Design a protein around this ligand. Structure first.
Ligand SMILES: [Mg+2]
Lengths: 50, 1316
RNA sequence: GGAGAGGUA
């Protein structure tokens, strides 16, 4: 991270756009609530409206 | 010892040196540079990794986030090379980069992370280099020629006394960065050191010296030696080092220690310094007149009042000395000066300097860089700090740092990329040292100072120049806030990157069009070393000296291949074995010689390192143990040949032919010609048109095979095997069992490029030179390209030449030519032209390509189809219609005036959204059928390969030959076999077959999506149609055909076969040259080549006669053995005892037209071997036979030279030059005829051509010449009416281009008029 | 029409 090595969590989204999040900020992470754990959709993270 | 393919026809190699190093890949410079460009670099020094690590990571201005970089990956090209070639688009790779954006937390301190995102994002299409070295940019193959420019570093120099009206030399020093601002120091004629940045206004160097946080005391410490002055009670006991006394004048009683050493009136001798140093004397009692005008070093201020007594750098006087001695100062520090060895050049520049403190220096510099702009304190320090000492706006690369340290006699190869204080101090120190007398300045033409900048480096610099813009935009928008939902596709924009790549590869100063009318022309164009370009000199601003050959050029740059005309020696070519360095300098290989034996290890010596050692000549007689057989051998030590000892040498030359280029080393007997005429020959060789039937050169130089295979024109086998299917169009190679891969077993297919258009309107084809079922090795040619024969270069034909003057039909340089050479159809060449018709959008709407053209009959439309396009294969002549077109009110394409031809291909492209006519659908459907045929034929031939592999691995482990074919070839797994790793091989083969099943069903439909797509075009055009015409330009009076030693000549009469000189056996000579061009133009190489060709076809006629009547293979074997023997210790030594008695007959068929002879360049065939070879033949050994005349039938006394000289037809055909005009169209602003031949243009009666008519009495001719025939628009129509009415009479008038002058003078503030 | 490059004498 510019001279500071950190442990992050790679969560992949749609169009395989990766997203690494800090382990300390773990409370921004939750399990699926749609109940489609084998068929959940894949959000475009940033957004398709651009 | 010899391969099967080279047993087909083996060239007799003369020459005596053993080769210790083969000629390398001839295109290795381009391939190595571009594979340093696009290839993943782990260390991060070469290629896109270097530029990305230079620029990325990019911070924001606020610093709340930054964009970093992970890796890059080139996409698969959307089209391959030949489809990009047809369509008219770049052969390009998309660049997909893994960018990574952090997000910091705001209220958290500097360095914390909210979030980080990563994706593969695209920027820019980069063109890929093709398999040979060319870039396909818009369907025109272009080559980026290498540059030869100023190596960054520091260069000391002196304009040799031709300035200042004095004869005084003015040394100067350039600090040349790789990228950034140059720095110049120079001496005034009055010994004042000056600086300038970027050749702006000159300043003294003390301003840039004080701007580095320096004051005057520090400077006079730095540049100068100290002399101590100790005022004591008794008359100025001064501390004097005796080494400062040498060469100087005595000025008083030099008496010390109670001893009179030196009287006045002496020059201070050696023995006086000797007695001062044995007497150990450190102080001399001197009078105070020795401070007549000397300078104090530092500030001296009072100890009690604390006031200034004398300033630093002030010339002391006796009152000043009194003030110093009265203030309690004992040490007086003076700068040591000297007439020769210590000039005080810094002190007067401090005197000239109007700056006393640092802010004054910075204000002066900020004024000097940007005049105007009233200076502020922060801007000046910022400007000077980013001018030289920032990693962004200044950069001496590793090459710059190498040259910078190696110049100053430092040690380290690496250091800071930017300048440092110590560096600039060293530059002033060394420059003043040169001015004092020690040290030495450089010569700028030395190849230690000139550096090859090839295609990878220039493209990387252009890509970085683009990347600086996009990081700037990213920095702008990233410094714009609310980054929380943002992704790195809208911050980066591919348009600046694609612009800065597309401009350079598309239209640059060194991105030039491929000279593609040979294999040789393209392979000598990819090796070209241009000194032009950005960062280099220009054609009309180049002196006599840079054009000249420097003696450093030996082995790096060829000295005899060079274009003639305005740029001599700016367009140098590489030598044969020469390499580029790690850094870029030109290095040449040399054999290492030990104490007395020439070894075989070779070192690639650079340019600077060539001077330090001593290197032998190329042809030094060594004999079987590495010993130089003489004692006085010729070497070069420091740019000077001399006879040195047997036992002083350091290196040996790798070959006799390492001096010359590859374009020049094909010249046989090059050691006999001139260098002027050999320059004309080796430059002339690159324009030989590919003839109809390529014929091998009888006298080659052994580099013919290397050029014809290193050029990518011959289709060469990748893996050896047995050929299984030869067509006229494709080659099927079954791979041998040892070369076969386990995964992707298969076979090999080659598709041969048929009659397509080379870049200068000649044809290239590939004829297969192998018949069915033949063993092929790796690296073997299979398909001959244009003007190649069995994988050796064959640019022209080889025919019978007799050197007699023949009745004035070959007067100056002309070439009398028998009609047998056109009857044999051996110089008539194909020329394939391209004619395109647009479908524009104009006012009153678009126009059609329909057949209904006004005012034409069935004579015009008799060749067209219904849809407006001529039939493929229709022969047309001039003035015809190939494509019909209309205007909304006749804008049809026509064949241009004078040419013939057969239409061989028609390509229609249509823009997307416009309906395609029935012709376009017809072309599309045979295109789709042919593509389905290609993919299905590949699939089923590869299916035959897979099933043959399966049957090959079914010969053991469960063999039932009948059960192979009970069930068909589709299911060859479920028959009887033992389930082991054999079955694992069959299961790998089965999934490979199913993989090909998938690949066919997707690749055919992908090809459909490519074909059916109506392509992009220019904005405005609906459909473009491009017909390809093909002509056979035969030969005629007027053409220019030449030799290989530059005896160019215009063929002047196709003489009938009967009239030609014929020998007593009756064979008529094909070409009768002129002997007169030999004693002046010193090309005796053509006479020896003629003699050697005559010997070669003497052996050819003996083998042909021995085969015509049937004689056994034992006669052929011994005769060919004797022929390949007979050298005076030659090196070839081919053994026919191992030839299997069909290969002798296969070789003897190929020698029935004359044995090829190889003569290496400077290891040539001597005259004695030629006499022995002629004596082996039944020919007279003097070379000259008795010819009879064709007409008189009598004997020419003084019998004449005949032979077989290798003649090229140059690409200046007379039908492309001959031009005429009576009256066509006219130019717009001036009513004069247009120029050129593309427009129907008349010639230019120029200024020197008007003085010739003034020089006669001729005036009315001149008056009609520049009024009526050209510009008097009232008068040129009346003239035309006057001829057609049969009355030659002129109305002179007044030319309208004089009225143009009147308007363009009167349009200033100048009145100009005509009087009464 | 203008640049850029290469070529011929
Ligand atoms: Mg001429």
């Amino acid at each position: 991270a510019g001279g500071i090595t950190g442990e992050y969590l790679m969560l992949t989204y749609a169009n395989d756009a990766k997203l690494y999040v800090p382990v300390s900020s773990l409370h921004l992470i939750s399990r699926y609530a749609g109940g489609a754990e084998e068929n959940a959709p894949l959000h475009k993270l940033g957004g398709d409206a651009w | 010892v010899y391969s099967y393919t080279e047993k087909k026809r083996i060239r007799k190699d003369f020459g005596k040196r053993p080769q210790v190093l083969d000629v390398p890949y001839l295109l290795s410079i381009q391939l190595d540079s571009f594979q340093k460009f696009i290839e993943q670099d782990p260390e991060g020094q070469y290629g896109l990794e270097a530029a990305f690590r230079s620029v990325f990571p990019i911070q924001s201005y606020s610093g709340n986030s930054e964009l970093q970089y992970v890796s890059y990956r080139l996409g698969e090209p959307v089209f391959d090379v030949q489809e990009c070639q047809i369509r008219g688009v770049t052969y390009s790779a998309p660049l997909r980069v893994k960018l990574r954006l952090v997000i910091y937390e705001r209220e958290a301190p500097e360095g914390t992370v909210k979030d980080i995102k990563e994706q593969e994002v695209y920027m820019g299409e980069i063109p890929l280099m093709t398999d040979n070295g060319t870039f396909v940019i818009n369907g025109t193959e272009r080559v980026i020629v290498s540059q030869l420019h100023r190596s960054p570093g520091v260069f000391f120099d002196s304009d040799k006394g031709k300035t200042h009206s004095s004869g005084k030399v003015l040394y100067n020093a350039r600090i040349i960065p790789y990228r950034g601002s140059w720095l110049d120091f120079e001496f005034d004629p009055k010994d004042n050191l000056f600086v300038r940045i970027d050749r702006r206004r000159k300043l003294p160097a003390t301003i840039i010296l004080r701007a580095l946080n320096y004051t005057t005391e520090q400077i006079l410490d730095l540049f100068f030696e100290k002399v101590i002055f100790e005022i004591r009670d008794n008359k100025l006991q001064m501390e004097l080092v005796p080494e400062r006394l040498r060469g100087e004048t005595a000025s008083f009683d030099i008496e010390a220690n109670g001893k009179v050493y030196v009287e006045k009136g002496r020059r201070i001798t050696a023995r006086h310094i000797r007695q001062l140093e044995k007497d150990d004397v450190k102080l001399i009692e001197v009078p105070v007149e020795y401070i007549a005008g000397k300078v104090v070093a530092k500030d001296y201020i009072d100890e009690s009042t604390g006031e200034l007594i004398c300033a630093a750098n002030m010339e002391l006087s006796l009152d000043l000395l009194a003030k110093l001695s009265q203030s309690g100062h004992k040490r007086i520090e003076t700068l040591f000066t000297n007439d020769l060895d210590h000039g005080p050049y810094i002190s007067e520049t401090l005197r000239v300097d109007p700056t006393n403190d640092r802010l004054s220096a910075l204000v002066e510099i900020y004024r000097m860089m940007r005049p105007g702009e009233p200076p502020t304190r922060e801007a000046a320090e910022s400007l000077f700090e980013n001018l030289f000492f920032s990693e962004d706006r200044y950069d001496l690369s590793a090459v710059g740092r190498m040259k910078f340290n190696r110049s100053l006699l430092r040690e380290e190869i690496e250091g800071s990329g930017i300048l440092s204080k110590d560096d600039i101090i060293d530059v002033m120190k060394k420059l003043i040292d040169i001015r004092n007398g020690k040290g030495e300045v450089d010569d700028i033409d030395h190849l230690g100072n000139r550096r090859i900048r090839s295609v990878g480096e220039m493209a990387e610099n252009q890509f970085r120049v683009g990347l600086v813009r996009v990081e700037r935009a990213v920095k702008e928008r990233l410094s714009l806030g609310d980054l929380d939902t943002l992704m790195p596709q809208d911050m980066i924009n591919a348009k600046p990157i694609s612009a800065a790549v597309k401009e350079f590869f598309g239209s640059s100063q060194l991105s030039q069009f491929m000279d593609q009318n040979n294999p040789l022309s393209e392979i000598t164009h990819k090796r070209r070393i241009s000194a032009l370009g950005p960062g280099g000199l220009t054609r009309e601003r180049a002196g006599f000296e840079v054009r000249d050959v420097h003696p450093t050029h030996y082995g790096r740059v060829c000295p005899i291949e060079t274009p003639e005309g305005p740029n001599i020696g700016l367009i140098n070519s590489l030598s044969v074995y020469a390499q580029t360095n790690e850094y870029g300098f030109l290095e040449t290989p040399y054999r290492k010689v030990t104490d007395g034996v020439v070894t075989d290890e070779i070192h690639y010596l650079s340019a600077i390192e060539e001077g330090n050692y001593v290197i032998a000549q190329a042809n030094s007689n060594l004999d079987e143990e590495g010993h130089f057989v003489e004692d006085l051998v010729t070497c070069r030590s420091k740019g000077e040949s001399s006879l040195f000892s047997r036992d002083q040498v350091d290196y040996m030359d790798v070959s006799t032919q390492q001096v010359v280029s590859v374009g020049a080393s094909l010249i046989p007997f090059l050691e006999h010609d001139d260098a002027n005429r050999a320059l004309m020959g080796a430059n002339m060789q690159r324009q030989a048109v590919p003839t109809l039937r390529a014929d091998k050169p009888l006298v080659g130089t052994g580099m013919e095979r290397a050029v014809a295979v290193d050029s990518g024109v011959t289709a060469v086998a990748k893996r050896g095997g047995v050929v299984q299917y030869v067509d006229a169009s494709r080659i099927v190679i079954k791979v041998n069992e040892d070369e076969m891969y386990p995964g992707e077993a298969g076979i090999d297919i080659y598709n041969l490029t048929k009659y397509t258009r080379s870049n200068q309107n000649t044809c290239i084809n590939q004829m297969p030179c192998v018949s069915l079922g033949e063993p092929v090795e790796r690296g073997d040619v299979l398909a001959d390209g244009p003007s190649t024969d069995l994988g050796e270069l064959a640019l022209g034909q080889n025919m019978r030449v007799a050197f007699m003057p023949w009745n004035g039909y070959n007067f100056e340089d002309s070439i009398l030519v028998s009609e047998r050479v056109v009857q044999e159809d051996r110089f008539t060449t194909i020329h394939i032209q391209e004619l395109a018709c647009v479908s524009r959008d104009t006012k009153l709407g678009p126009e059609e390509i329909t057949a209904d053209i006004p005012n034409v009959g069935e004579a015009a439309l008799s060749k067209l189809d219904e849809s407006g396009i001529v039939y493929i294969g229709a022969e047309v002549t001039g003035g015809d219609i190939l494509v019909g077109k209309v205007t909304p009110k006749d804008s049809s394409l026509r064949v241009p005036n004078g040419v013939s031809g057969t239409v061989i291909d028609v390509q229609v492209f249509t823009r997307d959204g416009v309906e395609k006519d029935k012709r376009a659908l017809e072309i599309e459907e045979m295109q789709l059928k042919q593509a389905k045929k290609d993919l299905s034929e590949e699939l089923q031939i590869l299916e035959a390969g897979l099933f043959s592999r399966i049957r090959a691995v079914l010969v053991a482990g469960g063999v039932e030959a009948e059960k192979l074919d009970k069930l068909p070839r589709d299911r060859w797994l479920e028959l009887g076999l033992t389930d082991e790793e054999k079955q694992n091989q069959l299961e790998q083969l089965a999934e490979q077959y199913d993989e090909l099943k998938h690949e066919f069903e997707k690749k055919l439909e992908a090809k459909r999506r490519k074909i059916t797509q109506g392509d992009d075009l220019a904005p405005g055009v609906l459909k473009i149609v491009k017909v390809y015409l093909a002509v056979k330009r035969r030969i005629q009076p007027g053409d220019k055909m030449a030799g290989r030693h530059g005896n160019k000549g215009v063929i002047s009469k196709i003489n009938p076969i009967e009239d030609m000189p014929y020998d007593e056996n009756g064979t008529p000579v094909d070409i009768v040259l002129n002997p007169l061009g030999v004693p002046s133009r010193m090309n005796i190489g053509q006479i020896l080549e003629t003699h050697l060709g005559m010997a070669a076809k003497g052996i050819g006629d003996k083998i042909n006669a021995m085969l015509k009547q049937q004689q056994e293979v034992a006669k052929l074997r011994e005769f060919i053995q004797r022929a390949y023997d007979l050298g005076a210790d030659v090196r070839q030594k081919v053994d026919l005892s191992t030839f299997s008695d069909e290969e002798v007959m296969r070789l003897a068929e190929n020698l029935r037209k004359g044995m090829p002879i190889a003569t290496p360049v400077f290891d040539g065939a001597k005259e004695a071997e030629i006499k022995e070879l002629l004596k082996l033949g039944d020919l007279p050994t003097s070379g000259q036979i008795r010819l009879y005349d064709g007409r008189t039938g009598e004997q020419f006394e003084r019998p004449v030279t005949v032979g077989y000289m290798y003649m090229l037809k140059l690409n200046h055909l007379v039908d492309d030059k001959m031009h005429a005009r009576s009256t066509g169209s006219y130019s717009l602003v001036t009513q004069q005829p247009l120029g050129g031949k593309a427009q129907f243009g008349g010639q230019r009666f120029g200024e020197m051509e008007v003085w010739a008519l003034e020089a006669y009495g001729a005036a009315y001719t001149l008056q009609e010449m520049l009024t009526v025939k050209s510009d008097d628009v009232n008068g040129r129509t009346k003239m035309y009416k006057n001829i057609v009415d049969g009355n030659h009479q002129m109305e002179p008038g007044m030319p309208e281009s004089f009225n143009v002058l009147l308007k363009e003078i009167r349009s200033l503030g100048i009145n100009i008029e005509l009087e009464d």
